[model samples]
Every structure is written in structure tokens, then in C-alpha cells.
Target: GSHMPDPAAHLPFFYGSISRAEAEEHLKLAGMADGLFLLRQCLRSLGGYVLSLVHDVRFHHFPIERQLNGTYAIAGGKAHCGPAELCEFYSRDPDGLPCNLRKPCNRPSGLEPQPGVFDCLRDAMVRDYVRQTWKLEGEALEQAIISQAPQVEKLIATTAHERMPWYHSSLTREEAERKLYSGAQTDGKFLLRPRKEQGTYALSLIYGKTVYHYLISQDKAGKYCIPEGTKFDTLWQLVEYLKLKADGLIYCLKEACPN
Candidate 1:
């Protein structure tokens, strides 16, 4: 009777933080080989908070029933089968209250398997975390992602571009800020200096109210000249051509007739 009772002796179970390898082991035990691999990859590129739910067995299976009942249904095993059943059983509540799984567990539209669905879910989860933790929304969240994750910056940038109304192959100068000037003094034309050696500027002229002309200025024989005239349906076409051919050239807007 002199020995002291163990503080946690009466507890039914105890939870403690586990290593990434251990988490992956649990995932593998639940028959989530692919999911475990993807979670490891995500953990390398993304923050733990962003992919926390990815390792949760319940999170992977919670939405299966809901998805089957909704428009995003996938032809998979029953809610009480395989990994899904294991996840559900382990995460079930003793009090009978419903458990709301994180959003990253949902399936995507495409049939490209784990990577595609993981990417879609990870994107949404990261955005949600950004919105909730930093109070950032829309463009601000996108900017944060671009700044924080340089490796995945292009992913966010491409998504932002694709969401715009004017995003297309025939992009206008106003939309193609990466290639053209968005805030140029278009009152008249002016000479453009090459940002680097061995490059040319894309120039244009209006022939009449209904006609427009295009030209490519080059450093020819120690002088800038527009050798031959070429026509393009859109300014993007001319700029794209120049970009491929004129590597290192700085494209600037100058007055057509300098005083």
C-alpha cells in the first residue's frame, strides 16, 4: 500500500507523437502504400500543417461514404471494406457524434490515380490553412504560397493564369505581363534598347484605321533595322516569336517619332 499508484495506470490508452517513418508504417499497415508514398513526398515539399491530415487514417476514409452518395462518386470498395473499413473502425466515436474529416481526403474529377487526387486535395488544404491561419484569401493566399513554396510557385502561377478570363494561347500584352509591357505609354511608339546583347525588339505600326503593321527590329551591321515586314494576327504572336529568336533582348515601348 506504500507504493504510489501510477498516474496513467487507469487510462484506457495513451497517445504520443510518432516519427514520420512510424506514421508511414501505420499507413502501410492500413494498405495505403501509394498514399504513404505521396504523403512522404508532400512532407518533403510542403509544411507539416499543410499535410497533417494526409497521414490520418480516418481522413483518408471519412469521405468515401459521402462521395458515394454525391456526384463525385468513385467505383471503389465498400465503406466497410479494406483500408476504408480499417480507418473507419479505428476513428469511430464512442459518443456516436459524427466525425468531420479534413477536406484533402476527397477524390478529384480525373482518373489519374493517387497523384492527381493528392495534388487536388493538397492544393485545397493548403489554401484553406492559409485562409484560416493568416486570414489571407484569394490573391493574397496565392501570393503567400508562391513566396513560401518556390518549388511549387509555378503551379500556383499557372492556376492563377488559367483562372483569368483572357488567359489563352493568343494572349494580349495586357495579359502577358511576363512577355510584354502592361503599363506602357502607348500614346506613340519609341525605340527599344536591348536588355542584353544579341536580341531584338518587337515593333508595330498602324498603317490606317483598318490596317496595322508589325516588324522585328534587329541589331544588323551595328545598326537597328526592321529588315522585312511580317504580319501577325495578335501581338502575342510577334512577341512569342521574338522571345524564341531574340534571347536576352529588352522590349521597351518608345515614341514612333521622337522629337
Candidate 2:
């Protein structure tokens, strides 16, 4: 909720809030692929900027305006901290934009959020894994999604065949600190602690002597999802999804607790 990289120009897809002319020039060089895009902010209004993107070589323009507190939102879409998360969101879910930004444009170097590719690949793989692991056909999987407790965790453990070394059934704040800091607690080290309540969990993360916890709440229908973002089917799926995007929490859930 508090940063715009100092050297924004270093970002391959963005510049330090350039002019309308420069914005077009840059992307034109990038070849204006269907979902390619870039953002420029240093404009007339303190909170106004333009998002110039492309769809079928026919570019489009999107004006991003922020709330008084300083968060950007696309037209009527969700509010995001800045272009960082803004692009991050549209890049994944078109929501209502012309296309999900499939590639970054303009800048000289190659850097579309390293995990951008990682995240995309995970979606492809995670989808197949979720379906294949259960081997449940359409309605069968639908039933499994709402089956309640033991079925929930069991399915989680199975779907979770990835993203672990993070979930621990019972652990408190201080106890989690000891377990996480036990490794000298460097950047990105975190853990998932299940609360006293069944199926409830919080993400415990630490960096620079500060420990932060994000409460993960279940979906209305009792599915393994969190209120902050999408409705995923497994806790591990939650971990997997969060690990790549930081829509709500400080940073994406990085390196899960070691132990």
C-alpha cells in the first residue's frame, strides 16, 4: 500500500510517467500485441494518468484515476495501490479491459515481473493439477467443492502437492516467530498457521524485525477461499495463488516457513 519504485524507468514496460507521444512510440516499438500495455502517470492531475495499450494492433487508451488517498483503478474496476498492482491485475484478469495484458511493452529491457511468467505457468499447471488430482468429472468435482471439513483438508493436501513447507495446523504468533526466525528470518520467510477455529488460517511473515499476519477467511459457501481475493478450491491453491500476487497483503507470500 506504499510504494512506486524509485527508478520507475528501469521497469521494462514503464517509464517515469512519460508524455503521450513517448507512450505511443515505445509501444509501437514493442509491436502492440493484443494484450501488450504500458502506463504513464506524471500527468496534469496529481492522480491522473493514461494507460495506452493494444488489441489486434489497434491500440486503445485507458485513463487511470486514483482516489484521494492514492490508489489507481481502471474505469470501474477494483482499486489497486499503483500501476504496479494495476497492471498486475489487468495482466491476469481482463475483468473488463479489452484484453488481459499478456505482455509488457515500451521499455528497453526484459522484465514483466519475473513471476509474471511463473504465475501464468502456474495457472495452466494448477488448473490441470486440480482437475487431474481429483479426477472428478464435472458435477462430481462440484460436489466435492462443498463437501465440508475432512473432505476439505484432504482435498487441500492432495491439491497442495505443491506450495508447501508453509502450512502448520497449530501455531501461535510467538511460536510462529520462533519457528520462522529460527532460520535467522530473512526476507520472504513466512508460514501459514491454522487458528483454533477449524479451517481458519493466517499468513505469518517477517522482514526487518517486523512480523505481519493476514487473516484468511473462508468463502460464504465454505470453500477453501479467502475474502481478500479469488475463490480457490484448496488451501494450497490459496497459497499457490497468493505466492504470486500481492493484491492485499504487503508482498506475495514468499518462501514459506521452513520446518
Candidate 3:
């Protein structure tokens, strides 16, 4: 069957975190004191997923924010174009500033800028590539955008300051946890679920305040597992981490008890 590719297969990639001095320089460049350090982190798991898709999914890290005049484009020139197309799908409505489409600015916009994902629409070549690959159009594209709006809106609205849990909305944290625990197939690093409840708890917890799980993996033999009495930082993390531990413990006891 033709299924989506596994995102974890593309792993062990490095992401650059900016230093305070460099960030200060960035603030100076934009000529602003500060508001929000709008950063564009790839939602994908590893660089390999990027390599698989476009072959040049390099990081374009920077510090910038959007404001009234014409908030600077915070993202780099080579970001994945998925967000923009999705934006265009929903851009038709005039809900507010940070919809699928951002309102254009004429003056010197301040540091508070529109989400970098919108930049995806500006790149016709990239859009064409994604369009072809996904076979996206009309309803398919609109649903794609609609599917993500609630979650994305939550991120923008909360801004990590409020620390609202993902479950505060209709989404579930467990589904996201399952993905990270099982290291199962992900649509993209972004972790978009076709159906809301279909994903793992780890994913649901992503829009929340803390990291939920400890990273774990399986070997070729697949006999070893996690044991009981294991503790985790969050419920979602516990599920995946404990699953492995329990599996391993069961294997060990099986030989001793002859069950």
C-alpha cells in the first residue's frame, strides 16, 4: 500500500540555538527593544525527512518579530512551503490579523511580525513542488489548512506564557505520547493528525508547557522492554517509556517463571 513515509528514519540532525549576544545583535538590527523573539523551528523530526522531501532542508535560524509597519520575515528563504499553501486555503476569510493570510503592511512594521510560515506562499517554485507531491487541491487543500487551524491558533494565542495544556482544547495529549513512545510513523515533524483523536498523547502535549517523554528505541531482537515502577515527567511520556520497560521485564521473567 502507498503510505506516508516514516519521519524518524531521518534522524540525528543538528539544530542551532542562538546565543544571548547574537540575539542582542538581532534585536539591534531590527531597531527594536523587544517584544517577542519569533523563531521558526521545523516541525519535522530529523534532517533526513527534509532531505527526503526537498534534499536541502537546511536550517535558517534567526531572531525577529512582527509589528504594524511590515514586520520582518522571521524565517529563512528556504523553509518548507507547506504552511503557506495551507494559509492560502484559509486566507479567504477576514477573521483577523493572524489567519491563514496575514494583512499587508505599508509602514515600517515593528518587531512583531507575521508567522514565517506565510513566507511559504511567496515561493511559487516551492509551492509547485509541494502541490505536485501531495496532490493537493480545492477541498483537500482547504481541509489541510482547516485541520491545523485550531492547533496553530492555540500556539499563537498562548505564546507559552499562558502555559495552557493541549487538552484544554479538543486535542488529546496521549495520542502524541504514543507516537514518541512507539516511534511510530509521523506525517511530518510537525505531527499533523488527519483525525484529531488519531494521534498520540505526546503530540497532543506538544502545544503545552513541558516535554512529556524520555526518548527510547527498540533493537532488532525486540525482546527487551521497560519494567514496572518506571516514572515519567508526564502521563504521555509514562505510557511509551513504561511500555518498553514492561516489555523488557516481561521477557526476563518469562525465562525464570517458564510462563
Candidate 4:
């Protein structure tokens, strides 16, 4: 509930001052394999801690106390500077501990360096073999990069594209072209709209009397590509890039239809 009186609390392996059950639960779900461990601030005494570990499917807690002049140690066992070194000390020399500090308990915060659980995109496990490759898998992360509507508008809160002056979700292919032609219908006047394919988009722009339609396709990774063109992070991302160059686009998307 409060920051401990000793040292900074930022280690990815340190779980702060969680209750006994939480530390147990964390290690349990991470697989109660030997030497799997995490650090916790001692609820018993502030600035002190206990190492919670699982060995041979059983749990162990070793006290970590700060000395009179402030040094870290395992239950008054050895003197050290930071828990950082304390860990380094134990990783190679278990000493009186059950085993060498093995794998760190994988934690969230997306910066854990080591991959764990759902953070991976490709993974495989076989007889005495295990594998995984990582990325964003935060459930909400997956929903975000993939994006919108008609599924109560599947996953709403309406993305920023809806309110952009360049976006017109209600326009159909013919309707957008008809209105574009009604204007000067000159090059570069453009509007973005959802296409017939729902998740896809249409870029309707004018290039001298002709309203060209380009399909803004979306891949599962949520990149926006204009048919055979390069992929951009978002629909507006492609628009910004297109604004700088005609490349293969009709007229460089100079003006966004305000409607």
C-alpha cells in the first residue's frame, strides 16, 4: 500500500508488497518448476523482504534484511549493495537457498525483457521442447491494432478516424463520386470512407473529371495499404504520406472532404 522505506522499487522481478496468496498465485500459474522465484517487500517489516520460491512443487520464503548501515542480505546471511547484486549473488551460488536463482518470474509492464505467456505471436511446445516468439498480446492490445464497427459496432469508442475532416463513413462509392464531381472535381480533392467490405476503406479522389477510387486494405496486423502499395500504421498515416507525394496515388490527397 505504500512505497517501502528502502531502495527504489522498480525491478521487473520484484512484485512489491503483495500478500502471501498473491505471490503464491503468481508463482503457481507461472509453473511451479524448481527455483522459480520473485521478490516481495516484507509485510512483516518495512524495508525488509522475503524471497518466495517454488522447489520440487513446494514453496519457500527466505528473508532479505537491510543491515545497520544499509546493505542487503538473504536472512542476515551475506552483505551486498542492491538487491540487484543480491540476485546476481544467488543466481550462481544458491548458498543455503534451495537452488540457484533460476528463471525470473515473468511479469507484465511490457518491458520484462524475457517473454512469458500471451506476450508472444508465435509459440510451439513439443516433447521435452518449448518455444515462443513475442509481441503485443494484451487482449486489449490485440483489439486495438485490429480495429471497428457492426460486430454493437464491434469494439467501439469510435476510433479517431471517424471525426477527422477527411473521413465520411456514411458515403457509398457512387455517392462520394457523384458529389466529388459536383465540386470543381479537380485533382487532389479527396474523402475517406468505409468500403463495402466493412473493415476496408475507400479513398475517393478527383484527378481532372474522374473520381478515382483506391481500396485502402487492412491486414491482420492493422496496417493500412492502398491495394498493392506500402503499408502504413493507420489510415491517416497513409494519407499524410500520400499528401507529400503522388507516387502511384491519383493526386496526392491534398484536400480532405469536410463532410
**Candidate 4 global TM-score:** 0.40
TM-scores, each model vs. reference: 0.16, 0.40, 0.18, 0.40
lDDT of 3 by residue, 38-86 (tens): 2222222111111101102221223222211222222232223333322
Off by over 4 Å in 1: 1-259
lDDT of 4 by residue, 143-225 (tens): 42323112211111123677667889689989998888887766899989997685699889998778899888876645567
Per-residue CA lDDT of model 2 for 189-222, tens digit only, reads 7888776766667788877757877777664434
Q: Whose TM-score is higher: candidate 1's or candidate 3's? A: 3
Estimate the overall C-alpha local distance difference test score of candidate 2.
0.61
Q: Is candidate 1 or candidate 4 better by lDDT?
A: 4
Ordered from best to worst lDDT, the candidate numbers read 4, 2, 1, 3
lDDT per residue, candidate 1, 45-87, as tens digits? 1111012133334423222122211111112423333223323
Q: Best by lDDT, which number?
A: 4
Which portions of model 4 show Cα errors greater than 4 Å? 1-8, 109-259
User: Model 3, poorest ten-residue lDDT window?
Assistant: 250-259
Q: In model 4, what is the error at residue 165, expressed in angstroms?
A: 66
RMSD of each: 20.5, 14.2, 18.7, 20.7
